[PDB]
Design a protein around this ligand. Structure first.
Ligand SMILES: CC(=O)N[C@H]1[C@@H](OP(=O)(O)OP(=O)(O)OC[C@H]2O[C@@H](n3ccc(=O)[nH]c3=O)[C@H](O)[C@@H]2O)O[C@H](CO)[C@@H](O)[C@@H]1O
Length: 419
């Protein structure tokens, strides 16, 4: 079991180049199952989930390869049951279902894996596909969908906002007969990116980025070339790294408009932030950040994917701040671990009350999920002494070369293989 051994304290400062969004690359890779011509996807991060997705697509019969850019030729896909081992290791696998039923009339996928930060049901994906005409049966952990002929467009009012289900419905709708209107659609930047990728292939979609997406189905999608947008969560993670470090960082290959809420909160924490067309700089001017109150919610509000990181920020900030997590019900797994490092926090229902301390102490901590793992590594960088983060495999799912990137900022980190 690989771990990260981190020696602190170290001030993280310098520059970092942001990789493509984990969460845009993934839905785009699965959306490629709809493509009847080859596609080249550029700026795809080298992440465990991307590798898993490529193997999954290959096992469905698509020709897949990469390198910098990922190439997919799904013309001859001929297997419609996603392999269990690949499906259970990440959340993104659920996205193989919609394209398979929309293009081939059938698809079978086991319930997905991914961070265990909640029960994470897929009822909205199922309900959406059923509204488009699919028949779905759940048996022995597999979601089995089928339709005789094409799906048919429908006016779907999502009764809960969901990033993943919005993607499932939007992608499947592109091959349906007629027009689909998705109400209460998730507005995340990755939904916009996925929609634009689909449009590149010939899909007819509008409203992406708003609560109402309209899709006019077409007979078939072609191919194309598309570059994935920057990872806003990786960007926020490194901005937080600089903030808690009382340092400065410039993030290159960034997309500032995907982070309005996060940047505003960092300014509230005392950060001096500037933005360019494709970069973001943060400078603490050597000052300890000020605690902030945060409430997570769907985009454009503060993202749940930055919650663990801001929990860390508050725990070393001046004063008391709270973070209310409204999106997932089991996303405070990092709190007990940070407490092992000297943090002062109390959990009250869906809110963590943080009381910042001057400095954390190194300790043996356990990564419990993706964003928690990144938060513990950052904690290790600023803590006094040695920190060992166990089960760091979690970090490889969403951060490309975080070890190298942190080292370039001044971190003393070593990946230790086998205890
Ligand atoms: C691979 C990927 O893109 N992952 C991101 C995506 O996941 P994901 O797509 O799973 O996020 P969702 O938006 O769907 O989940 C949000 C909330 O809706 C619930 N829900 C979701 C689907 C469903 O069918 N029924 C249901 O009840 C969830 O369990 C959760 O309580 O968005 C999340 C929220 O911004 C991020 O934190 C994840 O990193």
């Amino acid at each position: 079991m690989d771990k990260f051994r981190v020696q602190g304290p170290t001030k993280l400062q310098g520059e970092v180049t942001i990789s493509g969004a984990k969460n845009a690359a993934l839905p785009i890779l699965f959306a490629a199952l709809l493509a009847e011509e080859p596609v080249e996807i550029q700026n795809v991060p080298k992440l465990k989930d991307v590798d898993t997705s490529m193997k999954l697509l290959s096992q469905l019969g698509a020709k897949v390869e990469r390198x910098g850019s990922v190439h997919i030729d799904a013309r001859d896909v001929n297997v419609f049951c996603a392999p269990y081992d690949l499906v259970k290791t990440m959340r993104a696998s659920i996205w193989a279902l919609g394209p398979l039923v929309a293009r081939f009339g059938q698809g079978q996928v086991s319930l997905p894996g991914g961070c265990t930060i909640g029960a994470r049901p897929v009822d909205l994906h199922i309900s959406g596909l059923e509204q488009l005409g699919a028949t779905i049966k759940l048996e022995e952990g597999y979601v089995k969908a089928s339709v005789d002929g094409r799906l048919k467009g429908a006016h779907i009012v999502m009764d809960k906002v969901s990033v993943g289900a919005t993607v499932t419905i939007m992608c499947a709708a592109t091959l349906a007969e007629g027009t689909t209107i998705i109400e209460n659609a998730a507005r995340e930047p990755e939904i916009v990116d996925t929609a634009n990728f689909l449009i590149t292939l010939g899909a007819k979609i509008s409203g992406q980025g708003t609560d109402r997406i309209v899709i006019e189905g077409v007979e078939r999608l072609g191919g194309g070339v598309y570059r994935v947008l920057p990872d806003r969560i990786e960007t926020g993670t490194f901005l937080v790294a600089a903030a808690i470090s009382r340092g400065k960082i410039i993030c290159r290959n960034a997309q500032p408009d995907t982070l309005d809420a996060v940047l505003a909160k960092l300014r509230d924490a005392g950060a001096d932030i500037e933005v360019g067309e494709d970069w973001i700089s943060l400078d603490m001017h050597g000052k300890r950040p000020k605690a902030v109150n945060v409430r997570t919610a769907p985009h454009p509000a503060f993202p749940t994917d930055m919650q663990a990181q801001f929990t860390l920020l508050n725990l070393v900030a001046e004063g008391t701040g709270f973070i209310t997590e409204t999106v997932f019900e089991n996303r405070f797994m990092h709190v007990p671990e940070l407490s092992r490092m000297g943090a002062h926090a109390e959990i009250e229902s869906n809110t963590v009350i943080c009381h910042g301390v001057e400095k954390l102490s190194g300790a043996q901590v356990m990564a419990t999920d993706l964003r928690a793992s990144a938060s513990l590594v950052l904690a290790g960088c600023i803590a006094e002494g040695t920190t060992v983060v166990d089960r760091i495999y979690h970090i490889d799912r969403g951060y490309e070369r975080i070890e190298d990137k942190l080292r370039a900022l001044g971190a003393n980190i070593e990946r230790v293989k086998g205890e």
